[PDB]
Amino acid sequence: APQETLNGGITDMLTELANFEKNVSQAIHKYNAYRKAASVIAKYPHKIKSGAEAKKLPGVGTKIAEKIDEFLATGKLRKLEKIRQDDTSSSINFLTRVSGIGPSAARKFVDEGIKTLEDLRKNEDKLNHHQRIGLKYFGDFEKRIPREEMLQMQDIVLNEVKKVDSEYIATVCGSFRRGAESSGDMDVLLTHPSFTSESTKQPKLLHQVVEQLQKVHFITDTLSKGETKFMGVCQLPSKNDEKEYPHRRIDIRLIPKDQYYCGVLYFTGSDIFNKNMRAHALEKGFTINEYTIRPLGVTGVAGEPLPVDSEKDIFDYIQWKYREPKDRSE
DNA sequence: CCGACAACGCATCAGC
DNA sequence: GCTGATGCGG
DNA sequence: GTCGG
Ligand code: NA
Ligand code: NA
């Protein structure tokens, strides 16, 4: 990927605009429009000389091209400069960095005078459970996770899961599975042969695992927990007289056996890869989502889901030699 | 011109 | 009390 | 905001 020095001023600009659209104007589609434009320019291996030049890239239109011209000519954007200094808007934008606080809650808080973390700290009674944990670990949640820590975390998870029931199958997905040097969180996909799409499974397969992870003091807090999905916080044990590890976000999903591998594939990504794969899949008469892979009739009537016992199976259906997670950047 | 821009689990709200 | 809608997240 | 039927 091109050095940020090439078009970093532009992409940063587009990303800041993206956040305000999402967090302040509550215009999610404009948020994604800017992100797409930022991503396209980010991978552009040429220092952009004009809006017309950028305009040629998919996702860059008349408005963004116009903004690029202003930025190239003045090193800034008047609209962005103004919004940054706006106390209400900047405060709303900022509060959304707290996990659990979205555009709606941030707007409500600022409306009543609650604009900073300090303010949040003084008003715990106005925060739900999720938001309280988000505040407590605000700093930790923004710190990334080195692969070495991700490995230690995986060791614990795989060990405790097998200890509960050796028939469980757990796979740590996300960028980590693709070999990333760092992660933003840990995503664990869990399944058990007793659990399939059309049958009960003693609705507690997930609970048993969470409970064990809390028992060895790995999982420290719970954001949400149901029969199929758990979202919480975890922390590796600290070393003798050594700086305790920061708290990390961990999600754990229980997926039916027959839908497991479609899930591993999907939650492994990358998003760009999943896009290119779902596309390549369609031109082959197939549609792949998070749960299954289904054919398509002469009209489109996607028949029942096809049997999958591994990732490779999915690749075979669409005649696409199985690609190692390591090579799934796109 | 104007609709799509994903579909979904959990926590919590809105309203009967 | 339950049902559906909304907020939030990844 | 951008795309495309
Ligand atoms: Na374009
Ligand atoms: Na947030």
Side-chain angles (χ1 to χ4, degrees), chain A residues 1-200 202-330:
Chain A
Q3 292 184 299
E4 177 176 55
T5 304
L6 285 187
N7 300 300
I10 291 175
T11 63
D12 279 348
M13 170 181 95
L14 300 178
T15 294
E16 177 152 30
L17 284 169
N19 297 327
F20 282 113
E21 288 306 333
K22 175 183 61 176
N23 305 316
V24 181
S25 297
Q26 298 184 198
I28 197 61
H29 305 305
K30 281 190 180 179
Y31 156 74
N32 286 311
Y34 279 119
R35 291 173 72 196
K36 181 179 178 189
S39 294
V40 71
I41 288 164
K43 101 275 167 291
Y44 190 55
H46 297 290
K47 186 175 185 177
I48 300 175
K49 300 182 171 66
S50 74
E53 189 178 342
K55 223 287 188 174
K56 299 180 184 177
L57 304 182
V60 175
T62 303
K63 294 303 208 59
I64 296 186
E66 186 178 64
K67 285 174 159 61
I68 285 170
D69 285 328
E70 185 188 333
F71 175 87
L72 290 182
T74 74
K76 67 185 180 183
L77 224 67
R78 301 194 66 87
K79 284 183 178 180
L80 193 46
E81 290 295 76
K82 192 63 177 179
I83 196 74
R84 286 177 179 177
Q85 56 90 72
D86 192 282
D87 193 58
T88 290
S89 297
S90 67
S91 292
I92 287 175
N93 188 55
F94 169 69
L95 296 185
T96 65
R97 286 165 58 185
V98 181
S99 188
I101 295 181
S104 181
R107 172 83 91 142
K108 278 199 289 294
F109 288 138
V110 177
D111 283 322
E112 50 180 343
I114 304 176
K115 309 172 188 175
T116 67
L117 294 185
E118 292 79 304
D119 291 327
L120 294 180
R121 281 191 291 137
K122 310 189 307 174
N123 288 277
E124 164 173 287
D125 62 302
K126 299 191 166 185
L127 266 56
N128 55 38
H129 185 65
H130 191 317
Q131 295 165 339
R132 294 180 181 176
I133 299 173
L135 177 59
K136 183 178 188 170
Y137 304 119
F138 182 81
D140 283 5
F141 288 177
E142 296 201 325
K143 293 183 182 180
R144 293 187 62 66
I145 318 172
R147 189 182 186 68
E148 183 44 44
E149 278 178 45
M150 285 293 284
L151 285 171
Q152 296 178 55
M153 290 158 78
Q154 186 186 215
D155 289 347
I156 292 176
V157 173
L158 303 187
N159 184 54
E160 299 314 307
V161 165
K162 189 173 173 173
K163 184 185 298 176
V164 170
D165 191 324
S166 56
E167 290 191 283
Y168 272 122
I169 296 175
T171 312
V172 177
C173 306
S175 63
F176 169 79
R177 185 152 181 270
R178 307 202 306 283
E181 325 85 289
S182 73
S183 307
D185 59 23
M186 176 168 277
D187 193 17
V188 186
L189 273 58
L190 180 73
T191 197
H192 190 287
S194 71
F195 182 42
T196 56
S197 292
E198 47 193 61
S199 70
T200 57
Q202 302 152 179
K204 186 194 174 183
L205 283 176
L206 177 55
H207 178 278
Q208 296 240 303
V209 174
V210 174
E211 195 139 65
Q212 178 65 26
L213 291 172
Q214 296 175 300
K215 185 181 180 184
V216 296
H217 312 86
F218 177 60
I219 286 182
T220 67
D221 305 83
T222 301
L223 295 173
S224 55
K225 183 172 115 61
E227 283 174 49
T228 77
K229 193 175 183 179
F230 167 91
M231 294 175 76
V233 192
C234 64
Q235 172 188 50
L236 292 167
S238 56
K239 305 175 293 177
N240 302 182
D241 299 63
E242 277 186 291
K243 189 178 178 180
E244 58 172 282
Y245 286 106
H247 284 74
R248 315 295 200 182
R249 274 281 292 106
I250 181 168
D251 292 337
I252 303 176
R253 324 142 175 296
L254 181 69
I255 304 176
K257 178 64 172 180
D258 58 297
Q259 291 182 175
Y260 191 66
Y261 294 105
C262 271
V264 171
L265 170 65
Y266 180 78
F267 288 106
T268 292
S270 64
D271 297 312
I272 292 180
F273 175 95
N274 292 313
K275 301 186 67 60
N276 300 315
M277 190 170 155
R278 289 181 303 177
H280 179 67
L282 295 179
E283 70 175 304
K284 270 289 187 177
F286 290 105
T287 179
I288 308 177
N289 59 37
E290 175 200 312
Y291 307 104
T292 61
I293 174 176
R294 298 170 296 172
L296 291 174
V298 295
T299 297
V301 181
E304 302 311 300
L306 302 168
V308 183
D309 303 309
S310 63
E311 264 177 340
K312 175 185 167 54
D313 280 0
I314 310 175
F315 283 93
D316 292 335
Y317 278 122
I318 61 177
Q319 302 182 57
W320 214 28
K321 182 184 176 184
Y322 172 94
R323 207 192 305 172
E324 300 300 310
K326 152 195 282 295
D327 313 304
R328 301 179 193 175
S329 67
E330 57 187 306

